[PDB]
Amino acid sequence: AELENKVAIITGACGGIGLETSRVLARAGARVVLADLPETDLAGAAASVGRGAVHHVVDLTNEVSVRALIDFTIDTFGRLDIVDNNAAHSDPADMLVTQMTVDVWDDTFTVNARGTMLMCKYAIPRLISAGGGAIVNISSATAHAAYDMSTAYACTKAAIETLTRYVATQYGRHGVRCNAIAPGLVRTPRLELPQPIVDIFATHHLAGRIGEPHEIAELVCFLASDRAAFITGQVIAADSGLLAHLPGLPQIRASVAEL
Amino acid sequence: AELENKVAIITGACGGIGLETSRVLARAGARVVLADLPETDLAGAAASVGRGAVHHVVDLTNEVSVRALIDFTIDTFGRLDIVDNNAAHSDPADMLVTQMTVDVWDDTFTVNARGTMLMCKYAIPRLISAGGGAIVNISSATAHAAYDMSTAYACTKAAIETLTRYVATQYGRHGVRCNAIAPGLVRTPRLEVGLPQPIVDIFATHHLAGRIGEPHEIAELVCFLASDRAAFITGQVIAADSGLLAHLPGLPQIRASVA
Amino acid sequence: AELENKVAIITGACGGIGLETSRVLARAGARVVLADLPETDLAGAAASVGRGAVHHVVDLTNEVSVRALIDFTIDTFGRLDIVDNNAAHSDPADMLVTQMTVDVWDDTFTVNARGTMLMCKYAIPRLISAGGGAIVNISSATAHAAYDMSTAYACTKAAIETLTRYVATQYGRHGVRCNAIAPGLVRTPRLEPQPIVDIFATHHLAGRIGEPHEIAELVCFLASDRAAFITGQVIAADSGLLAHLPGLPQIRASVAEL
Amino acid sequence: AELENKVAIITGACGGIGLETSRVLARAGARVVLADLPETDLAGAAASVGRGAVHHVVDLTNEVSVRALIDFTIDTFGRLDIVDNNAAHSDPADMLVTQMTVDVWDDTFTVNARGTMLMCKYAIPRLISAGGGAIVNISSATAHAAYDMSTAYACTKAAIETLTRYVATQYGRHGVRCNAIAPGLVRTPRLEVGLPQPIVDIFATHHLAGRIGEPHEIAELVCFLASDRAAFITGQVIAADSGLLAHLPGLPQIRASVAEL
């Protein structure tokens, strides 16, 4: 059991990737705390995961709420070993820089950058008390390669990537590891961008398809585990080599096939 | 001359690097506008720069003030070709993740991340009307490699690096280039009061030239990246850090042990 | 069983990292083929791994020999799923750029760059015939950060990092993944000048050098269906060696003084 | 001017990027030495550059020849300040991994990786005698982003980026800078005989300025990194590729689609 006995918190737990992750971590022996906003079916989520899974509301914009979540984990299990900072805000008016408003921008940084920082701020000493532990932060390929939307979101993911290196560095000596995952496109309900945009993206993933939630859950599980004890402060792409190839490859292939 | 007849905004112009960037840009032929907080001596900086350099106050935390800066420039010169987003907030209580307060975090993100974004928001329309132009955003080595201080600062610079890519991708078809510089340690008045000498000296050893940087050595890179010589360089993050991060840690101790 | 039913080839299988990667993969349920030079004790390494591990010589400088290894695996087990390109030549005359001899450079490139390419050249069509599979290439942190020795070696690992992307790019459509691992300092016999080893140890964030098993686990993960959506990557198993500013320990000691 | 009184060796000096980098370095005040294989027209290239440019044959595959080029420069000029390792072999048989031959591979690595190490090996001591100096190594976008051809070429370039980091680290202390430039598609005579047009047009749309580069846009970046304006830039790999690798792959067709949607 790769995570035998560890206590894990997953944020954004009612989301596509968040639910599946909680599942995989439970399946590997962890006692999972599912966390998400009050409006969501946390209870249905936890019931579905099973394996002793519990749940508690969290609002990353609220330092006291972020703190209440960790303190609840400690009330319930007496310890904390693992945290998947998976939650993320993405406003649909997050388009072009010239079109950016301060509200869309600030809402997105408050949840994503500040909130993840707060989660680390209060998780870390618990990890240290436990004898060491693991934080996995979810970033995104969008931090590394741009397009005509998600400017705020993208930039917050970049902040989180640097935040990963700071946690890893400052707390390595106390036995805490921190890594980040930059996923490519993953089939979620927050997807189900229109179909022909998805089809376009799909051709540029080297498997020829978008990812499935469990393919991110499996890297979270691994990075959260002792098998990764010499892996820290890294950003690891789970994106089917989206950025490993020259752009224009699919149409160069079609072109070569003609000529 | 490299920037003949170009109109340039330098924010943080009273600072070590910004004042010096102002000199090199104006020495390379630019009509420069020096901008910084109202309690700074903008009059004196513009005087010391000469060559028809002007000055206008700006408060990056305030969109009105950003709007007012860009418009002053257009009222005065009728065009805008270059922006150097050089201003940066850096709080002395900006220490460890676990010690972070939301006030230190937001102050920093409001000036650095949001402010730079607001500067790009209003400058881009004008640069397009020039028939293309350049934006240089200052980042920092610290975004890429961590230590026990400047976490918030570090994370905001990460954000500006992604922003830079988004600005390049979005407005390349309209003749706008955007690049970021990532300085190593650079000798400024901020620096002398931030770090004590023994630690500065330690850092100096990990720069391959065996010394820390001088402001003008960052200014020249700004100048090249803002100039038409960089016509085919856009969306990059370029380190001016004496290969601070190009060598294995422990090199000087390895070398000392070899002697 | 993370790799139940898979056939794997490990090169440099008698080495510290290669042997201990062989155990782990075998423990995961893979049928493993240990490959190394004829003067190494392959049978004893295969014995120590057990679990049906077999062995066969290979000289990575020689194309015929690489072919013979792939063909041996295929004729034995009827398939191939995993290749850990772990073998590496590391010459002790490999010092500074201005002292470099063509012999040391070429010797190092022939085994590491050309050799890794030849293993891929002939594994790829087989992995394709198996429905798809994974290749893992061992790089080195030294490719991204220089010092006063190992110049040829680091340069060959960079070439390997590029090879990895090409393999992953060219053959992704046909079911083949390829990823690279860049280790920090790991404890082996080849390793064992102590004063240098402890200096390096302070700059790994665990404050120690790596263990071979800690590289093995990552090869294992990357060779498995759990990594189905990871490909073309270079991943650091270096305890954050390059995620922090250099000078950190010395800064921390100065801060413990003042 | 930016390289006043500085002595510069440029390899591959008859090729599109080489010849144009020679002119620019020379326009910037450098005493330039054009170096390329004996079957190229070095005399014509130096006549084109003017400004006192000289020429001399080199074969990167021959250690005795690399040394002879460095010894010639010192004989003529008494010093060496700048080397632009621009020469690269690039073989049309260099297609896919599964199709790679040992000869295509070895020929490419002997010229590109080994050749460039030998240039530095013989140049660096002279850069140190002159009180410090600058090396600029030419790489390629293709070491970072893979496609269906030029595997070997691309791996040698990767080797050269790490090599750059090793020169920079080993000789920083003695006053020697070393950087690399990774170009995107640049209009040269070789792309006119290398890739067909409809493939050039596809690549062109993925470069953010909506076109392939010109050789001078590379030359200017070489010029700057060779000069004392770059004194605190060392060990880097800088892309002059109009952000070919800063955007999501598929952007142009996503834009085509979003306009129809």
XYZ file of C-alpha atoms in Angstrom, chain C residues 79-193:
115
model
C 8.086 -9.594 -26.824
C 9.640 -6.401 -25.468
C 7.904 -3.707 -23.398
C 10.533 -1.774 -21.463
C 14.069 -0.530 -22.095
C 16.014 1.199 -19.399
C 18.982 2.695 -21.197
C 21.125 2.779 -18.025
C 24.661 1.937 -19.325
C 27.194 4.811 -19.298
C 30.928 5.287 -19.855
C 32.674 7.724 -17.593
C 36.447 8.197 -18.170
C 38.602 9.590 -15.354
C 40.706 11.575 -17.899
C 37.400 13.454 -18.592
C 38.380 16.739 -16.878
C 38.531 20.313 -18.250
C 37.581 21.454 -21.785
C 41.138 22.643 -22.566
C 42.579 19.183 -21.460
C 40.049 17.094 -23.414
C 41.475 14.428 -25.726
C 39.499 13.173 -28.721
C 39.876 9.614 -27.350
C 38.068 10.385 -24.054
C 35.411 12.452 -25.873
C 34.804 9.910 -28.599
C 34.948 6.935 -26.256
C 32.335 8.659 -24.100
C 30.074 9.650 -26.983
C 30.298 6.270 -28.731
C 29.015 4.376 -25.715
C 26.588 6.956 -24.271
C 25.078 8.857 -27.257
C 25.538 6.508 -30.206
C 24.990 3.477 -27.989
C 21.691 4.750 -26.497
C 20.512 5.600 -30.048
C 21.331 2.107 -31.298
C 19.406 0.504 -28.415
C 16.459 2.714 -29.374
C 16.893 2.155 -33.095
C 16.290 -1.611 -32.575
C 13.968 -1.616 -29.507
C 11.439 0.736 -31.151
C 10.054 -1.625 -33.837
C 9.651 -4.296 -31.100
C 7.924 -2.039 -28.591
C 5.670 -1.115 -31.532
C 4.886 -4.803 -32.174
C 4.040 -5.293 -28.472
C 1.181 -2.769 -28.739
C 3.426 -0.012 -27.388
C 5.841 0.388 -24.508
C 8.194 2.688 -22.620
C 11.859 3.600 -22.786
C 13.755 5.225 -19.947
C 17.003 7.055 -20.580
C 19.367 7.898 -17.707
C 20.766 11.397 -17.997
C 22.589 13.315 -15.227
C 22.151 16.592 -13.346
C 25.577 17.463 -14.766
C 23.964 18.165 -18.147
C 22.168 21.194 -16.680
C 24.944 22.394 -14.343
C 28.684 22.308 -14.957
C 31.750 21.753 -12.905
C 35.467 21.253 -13.476
C 35.162 17.607 -14.488
C 33.105 15.166 -16.582
C 32.772 17.507 -19.577
C 32.299 14.802 -22.222
C 29.975 12.765 -20.015
C 27.609 15.702 -19.298
C 27.526 16.651 -22.972
C 26.536 13.052 -23.918
C 23.686 13.163 -21.393
C 22.373 16.326 -23.033
C 22.347 14.520 -26.403
C 20.429 11.722 -24.658
C 17.886 14.235 -23.326
C 17.318 15.397 -26.928
C 17.187 11.815 -28.175
C 14.434 11.172 -25.633
C 12.199 13.903 -27.030
C 12.785 12.646 -30.607
C 11.888 9.091 -29.686
C 8.819 10.263 -27.788
C 7.852 12.598 -30.685
C 8.527 10.340 -33.663
C 6.935 7.208 -32.173
C 4.228 8.497 -29.836
C 1.569 7.926 -32.484
C 2.634 4.232 -32.525
C 2.291 3.717 -28.742
C 5.863 4.376 -27.598
C 6.721 6.618 -24.677
C 10.236 7.757 -23.815
C 11.323 9.747 -20.776
C 14.654 10.597 -19.142
C 15.739 10.777 -15.472
C 18.492 13.152 -14.335
C 19.976 11.852 -11.087
C 21.855 13.897 -8.552
C 24.634 12.225 -6.623
C 23.846 8.554 -5.963
C 25.795 6.107 -3.817
C 27.610 3.496 -5.914
C 30.964 1.736 -6.135
C 31.936 3.871 -9.173
C 31.463 6.890 -6.817
C 33.532 5.398 -3.942
C 36.831 11.314 -3.157
